[PDB]
A paper describes a structure:
Influenza viruses contain a single-stranded, negative-sense RNA genome complexed with RdRp, which comprises PA, PB1, and PB2 subunits. The virus acquires host primers required for transcription initiation through a “cap-snatching” mechanism. The PA subunit of influenza RdRp is a bridged binuclear metalloenzyme, with its N-terminal domain (PA-Nter) housing the endonuclease active site responsible for cleaving RNA segments.
Using an AlphaScreen-based assay, we determined the inhibitory potencies of more than 30 flavonoids, identifying luteolin (IC50 = 73 ± 3 nM) and its 8-C-glucoside orientin (IC50 = 42 ± 2 nM) as the most potent PA inhibitors. Furthermore, we performed structural analyses of PA-Nter complexes with luteolin and orientin, detailing their binding poses within the PA-Nter active site. Moreover, X-ray crystallography of the luteolin–PA-Nter complex clearly revealed that it binds to the endonuclease active site. The Mg2+ cation is coordinated by Glu-80, Asp-108, the C-3′ phenolic group of luteolin, and three water molecules. The high affinity of luteolin can be attributed to surface complementarity and a strong hydrogen bonding network, evidenced by the well-defined electron density map of luteolin in the crystal structure. In luteolin, this C-7 phenolic group interacts with Glu-26 of the PA subunit. The presence of phenolic groups at the C-5 and C-7 positions significantly enhanced anti-influenza activity.
Author numbering: -1 to 53, 73 to 196
Write the structure that this text describes.
Amino acid sequence: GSMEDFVRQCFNPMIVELAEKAMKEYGEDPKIETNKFAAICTHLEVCFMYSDGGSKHRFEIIEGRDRIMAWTVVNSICNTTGVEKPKFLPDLYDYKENRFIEIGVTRREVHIYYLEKANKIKSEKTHIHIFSFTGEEMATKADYTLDEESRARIKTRLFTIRQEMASRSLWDSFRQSER
Ligand SMILES: O=c1cc(-c2ccc(O)c(O)c2)oc2cc(O)cc(O)c12
Ligand SMILES: [Mg+2]
Ligand SMILES: [Mn+2]
């Protein structure tokens, strides 16, 4: 309710519109599952920030793209690099390291979400990078891909979001709602 308002105020309209569409495609109503709505918005925002954290066009964004375009990007990349085709769409491709990236944002402990992602992925080559809202991070082989300053920007954004939700008394419900 107030969470819906929070989302519409806190996130850029491009992000919010994407999230609304994404949820509706799974039969979920943004105006009802408002915690899910915020979580989806945050994860997308983190994918965009992450993609801007290195050199100009170091990263292809895959999250947020319609399915056809996403798989176009992915098949194309596996075709031009010989890198293995994932079973599920990842979040980005790193041109410098030549590997796909799965981004996780979690309210819980990072190690728990890291393991869930890892054992869902199956693809031996896709890098995993997990962020929490309380400034923790965890990445495959402890390789964090970006420099400390770019990661600090994400971590601080996430902290500010959590503080803002707390300010409005939404943080408790948000945190507990993660399944
Ligand atoms: O767009 C959605 C995106 C995702 C999602 C969740 C975690 C990830 O690490 C990720 O890369 C994507 O999960 C959802 C879960 C939903 O219930 C509805 C949605 O629209 C989404
Ligand atoms: Mg994704
Ligand atoms: Mn992800």
